[PDB]
Amino acid sequence: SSETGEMGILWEFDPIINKWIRLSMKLKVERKPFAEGALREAYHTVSLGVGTDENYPLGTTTKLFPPIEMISPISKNNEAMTQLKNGTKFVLKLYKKASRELYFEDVKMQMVCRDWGNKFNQKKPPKKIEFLMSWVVELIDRSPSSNGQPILCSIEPLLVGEFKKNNSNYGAVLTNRSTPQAFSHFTYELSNKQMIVVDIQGVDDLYTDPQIHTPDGKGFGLGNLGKAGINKFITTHKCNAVCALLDLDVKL
Ligand SMILES: [Zn+2]
């Protein structure tokens, strides 16, 4: 896209292949954020097109993430081209002060959840589910951080409407809605008790910002509360109609 904007390197994860896709994009960001936290700020932004990474060759990196073996050389099949197509309005998130690896893990996590989202929908439930696409972006045209590292930011599509938390990452149950609860339960059982997708939130059944727990506690960022988090979900969990429809064992 021709018009005056910022350039950026766009990373997309493929949970099917377990590999990272590398891309380029041009984007126009608003000077002022429309949201704040103690942790992060959110900025409205427009896509001025998505392209391939060829002009910005990755080279041989020693200490960055991800490693080359983790990268897919082919990029042809991806969501970004279409979802972040020229003209598209979206959200840009910025974390204050954590590390590179963890930024990528968030996006990895998101994709894994999105995937299980589709696995859930395959079983033809009354209400279908979707997790938002997310992406890592390297802001190249901006001068790098205090350390050598360039400026990193996460990105997702606009999420319009009344935002609702249905469960939490530590066993809270926050809505009478039964679908979100069933979905987390579903993920626990069908993963052979290896993972849960909790912290299910968003507008209706369009979800974002999830969190995964795993027994060993390894992976999926600092929000992974391991066996503890899994227990908390289970101790508060009451199976419902949708649990039942899916042949979900009442015992966890
Ligand atoms: Zn259940």
Residue numbers in the entry: 553 to 649, 655 to 809
Question: What sentences appear in the manuscript?
Answer:
Dictyostelium myosin-II heavy chain kinase A (MHCK-A) phosphorylates the α-helical coiled-coil tail of myosin-II, causing contractile bipolar filaments of myosin-II to disassemble into inactive monomers. MHCK-A is a member of the atypical α-kinase family of serine/threonine protein kinases. The α-kinase domain is bi-lobed, with the active site located in a large cleft at the junction of the two lobes. The α-kinase N-lobe is similar to the N-lobe of other protein kinases but the C-lobe has a distinctive structure and requires a tightly bound zinc atom for stability.
We purified and crystallized A-CAT in the absence of nucleotide, and were able to obtain a crystal structure for the apoenzyme (Apo-A-CAT) at 2.9 Å resolution. The asymmetric unit contained eight monomers of Apo-A-CAT (labeled A to H) organized into two nearly identical tetramers (A-D and E-H). The X-ray crystal structure of Apo-A-CAT reveals a novel autoinhibited conformation for the α-kinase domain. The active site cleft is an open state, but nucleotide binding is blocked by the side chain of the conserved Arg592 residue in the P-loop. Superimposition of the Apo-A-CAT and A-CAT·AMP structures shows that there is a rotation of the N-lobe relative to the C-lobe. The main component of the barrier is the side chain of Arg592, which is translocated towards the front of the catalytic cleft by the upwards twisting movement of the P-loop that occurs in Apo-A-CAT. Instead, all eight molecules in the asymmetric unit exhibited a strong difference Fourier map that allows a phosphoryl group to be unambiguously placed in a covalent bond with the side chain of Asp663. The inhibitory position of Arg592 is reinforced by interactions with Asp766 and Tyr647, which in turn are positioned through interactions with the P-Asp663 phosphoryl group. Of most interest is the interface between molecules A and B (identical to the G-E interface), which involves the insertion of a phosphothreonine residue (P-Thr612) from molecule A into the Pi-pocket of molecule B. The interactions formed by the P-Thr612 phosphoryl group are equivalent to those formed by Pi and involve hydrogen bonds with the side chains of Lys684, Arg734 and Thr736 and the main chain amide of Ser735.
